[PDB]
Design an enzyme around this catalytic site. Structure first.
Site, PDB file in Angstrom:
ATOM      1  N   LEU A  44       0.821  -1.218   0.000  1.00  0.00           N
ATOM      2  CA  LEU A  44       0.000   0.000   0.000  1.00  0.00           C
ATOM      3  C   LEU A  44       0.845   1.254   0.000  1.00  0.00           C
ATOM      4  O   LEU A  44       0.420   2.273  -0.530  1.00  0.00           O
ATOM      5  CB  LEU A  44      -1.001   0.023   1.169  1.00  0.00           C
ATOM      6  CG  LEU A  44      -2.121  -1.019   1.136  1.00  0.00           C
ATOM      7  CD1 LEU A  44      -3.019  -0.906   2.360  1.00  0.00           C
ATOM      8  CD2 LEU A  44      -2.921  -0.952  -0.168  1.00  0.00           C
ATOM      9  N   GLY A  45       2.022   1.179   0.597  1.00  0.00           N
ATOM     10  CA  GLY A  45       2.925   2.313   0.695  1.00  0.00           C
ATOM     11  C   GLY A  45       4.172   2.025   1.502  1.00  0.00           C
ATOM     12  O   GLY A  45       4.357   0.922   2.023  1.00  0.00           O
ATOM     13  N   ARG A  46       5.044   3.044   1.583  1.00  0.00           N
ATOM     14  CA  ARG A  46       6.337   3.064   2.282  1.00  0.00           C
ATOM     15  C   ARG A  46       6.489   4.439   2.927  1.00  0.00           C
ATOM     16  O   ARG A  46       5.801   5.399   2.550  1.00  0.00           O
ATOM     17  CB  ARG A  46       7.511   2.912   1.276  1.00  0.00           C
ATOM     18  CG  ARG A  46       7.503   1.687   0.386  1.00  0.00           C
ATOM     19  CD  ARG A  46       8.759   1.638  -0.461  1.00  0.00           C
ATOM     20  NE  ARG A  46       8.607   2.350  -1.729  1.00  0.00           N
ATOM     21  CZ  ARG A  46       9.523   2.370  -2.692  1.00  0.00           C
ATOM     22  NH1 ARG A  46      10.673   1.723  -2.541  1.00  0.00           N
ATOM     23  NH2 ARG A  46       9.297   3.036  -3.816  1.00  0.00           N
ATOM     24  N   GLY A  47       7.443   4.523   3.841  1.00  0.00           N
ATOM     25  CA  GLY A  47       7.822   5.741   4.546  1.00  0.00           C
ATOM     26  C   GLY A  47       9.212   5.570   5.123  1.00  0.00           C
ATOM     27  O   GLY A  47       9.888   4.581   4.813  1.00  0.00           O
ATOM     28  N   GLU A  51       6.620   0.159   6.119  1.00  0.00           N
ATOM     29  CA  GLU A  51       6.118  -0.320   4.829  1.00  0.00           C
ATOM     30  C   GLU A  51       4.744  -0.922   5.133  1.00  0.00           C
ATOM     31  O   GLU A  51       4.623  -1.696   6.084  1.00  0.00           O
ATOM     32  CB  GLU A  51       7.058  -1.371   4.240  1.00  0.00           C
ATOM     33  CG  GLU A  51       8.348  -0.802   3.681  1.00  0.00           C
ATOM     34  CD  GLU A  51       8.893  -1.594   2.509  1.00  0.00           C
ATOM     35  OE1 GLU A  51       9.401  -0.961   1.557  1.00  0.00           O
ATOM     36  OE2 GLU A  51       8.793  -2.845   2.525  1.00  0.00           O
ATOM     37  N   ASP A 155       0.313  15.001  14.120  1.00  0.00           N
ATOM     38  CA  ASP A 155       0.531  14.741  12.693  1.00  0.00           C
ATOM     39  C   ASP A 155      -0.811  14.737  11.924  1.00  0.00           C
ATOM     40  O   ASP A 155      -1.063  13.864  11.080  1.00  0.00           O
ATOM     41  CB  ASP A 155       1.349  13.438  12.477  1.00  0.00           C
ATOM     42  CG  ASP A 155       2.144  13.340  11.168  1.00  0.00           C
ATOM     43  OD1 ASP A 155       2.282  14.359  10.476  1.00  0.00           O
ATOM     44  OD2 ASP A 155       2.658  12.244  10.863  1.00  0.00           O
TER      45      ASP A 155
END
Ligand SMILES: CC(=O)Nc1cc(Nc2cc(NC3CC3)n3ncc(C#N)c3n2)ccc1[C@@H]1C[C@H]1CN
Length: 331
Positions: A44-47, A51, A155
């Site tokens: 779905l995504g990374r940061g 992950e 955030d």
């Protein structure tokens, strides 16, 4: 002379009245599930810190979200877990379903309730005036809840708000930057996305509180009603305060610095200049005017204040005329 201290105007001692284990996350002992209950479906995504994957719980055939944590301080992992468990069952707060670990890699993974999200860069442009007031009221339910529970998210930005528009379902996600509020505590100002950072972060005022989230919510609102993302578009943290001062004016900023005896960074002296407080009308145009109303502008003004003590609380914000229709339709 040092900086003048500050206390939260609401829910000041909620953690003081709680047993220490509520907020003493450093001493929290993690409860682990079985990693073999989950099979990863797709990425779905990374940061920088994780992950994330869509997964299947093979024991009940339920769709979940898996946040496989990248190597970080164990107390930071405990903080997120502790905060997630404390806010469990809370309005519009993501649910932490499970906590698992790889037996070979020893990597922790956080399992979340799945929200069938419609990407904010596609959803927002379809949202009406009522949609914006409805969802703003839903984030406010989640902020007042976590604030009443002694937690500041720190955030709040569109990316951390999951919306299933079909079912009008909202979840405030990603509690990795969240902290517990303690009166007198000085926090890290290197938190939040550049664009959503409050004046307190930019001037280096460390004794901040829940009111930090109200600034972020104000930045989010301005991007939505004006169709300008990001609303304050700084090139760095220094220029970020200049972009704010060009809208709010430098008078209220220097009065804020004065009140709290803030030693301003000398880099600021030459870049801030002299700016007047602009009227919100200069961001209104033919393409956004259907989302802008005198109510919306009044609400926005009361959120975007330098002085953190003068911003609306999440409960005060829920009582604003901008939400009268939403409140009425909720009965
Ligand atoms: C798990 C986290 O907080 N982070 C993160 C989350 C997502 N995406 C989604 C998507 C969905 N549903 C969409 C329709 C598939 N849901 N539903 C619930 C949750 C949760 N919690 C969630 N997260 C993407 C990227 C990250 C990156 C680590 C961040 C770096 N900024």
């Amino acid at each position: 002379s040092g900086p003048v201290p500050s206390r939260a105007r609401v829910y000041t001692d909620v953690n003081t009245h709680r047993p220490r284990e509520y907020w003493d996350y450093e001493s929290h002992v993690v409860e682990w599930g079985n990693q073999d209950d989950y099979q990863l479906v797709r990425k779905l995504g990374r940061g920088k810190y994780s992950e994330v994957f869509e997964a299947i719980n093979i024991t009940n055939n339920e769709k979940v979200v898996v946040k496989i944590l990248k190597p970080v301080k164990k107390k930071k992992i405990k903080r997120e877990i502790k905060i997630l468990e404390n806010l469990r069952g809370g309005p519009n707060i993501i649910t932490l379903a499970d906590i698992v670990k790889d037996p070979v890699s020893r990597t922790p993974a956080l399992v979340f309730e799945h929200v069938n999200n419609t990407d904010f860069k596609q959803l927002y442009q379809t949202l009406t005036d009522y949609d914006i007031r409805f969802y703003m009221y839903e984030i406010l339910k989640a902020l007042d809840y976590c604030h009443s529970m002694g937690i500041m998210h720190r955030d709040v930005k569109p990316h951390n708000v999951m919306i299933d528009h079909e079912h009008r379902k909202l979840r405030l996600i990603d509690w990795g930057l969240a902290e517990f509020y303690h009166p007198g505590q000085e926090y890290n100002v290197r938190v939040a996305s550049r664009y959503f950072k409050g004046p307190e972060l930019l001037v280096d005022y460390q004794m901040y509180d829940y009111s930090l989230d109200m600034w972020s919510l104000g930045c989010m609102l301005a991007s939505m009603i004006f169709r300008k993302e990001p609303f304050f578009h700084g090139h760095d943290n220094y220029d970020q305060l200049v972009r704010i001062a060009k809208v709010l004016g430098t008078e209220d900023l220097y009065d804020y610095i004065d009140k709290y005896n803030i030693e301003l960074d000398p880099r600021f002296n030459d870049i801030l200049g002299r700016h007047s407080r602009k009227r919100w009308e200069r961001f209104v145009h033919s393409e956004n005017q259907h989302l802008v109303s005198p109510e919306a502008l009044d609400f926005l003004d009361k959120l975007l204040r330098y002085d953190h003590q003068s911003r609306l609380t999440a409960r005060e914000a829920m009582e604003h005329p901008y939400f009268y229709t939403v409140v009425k339709d909720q009965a």
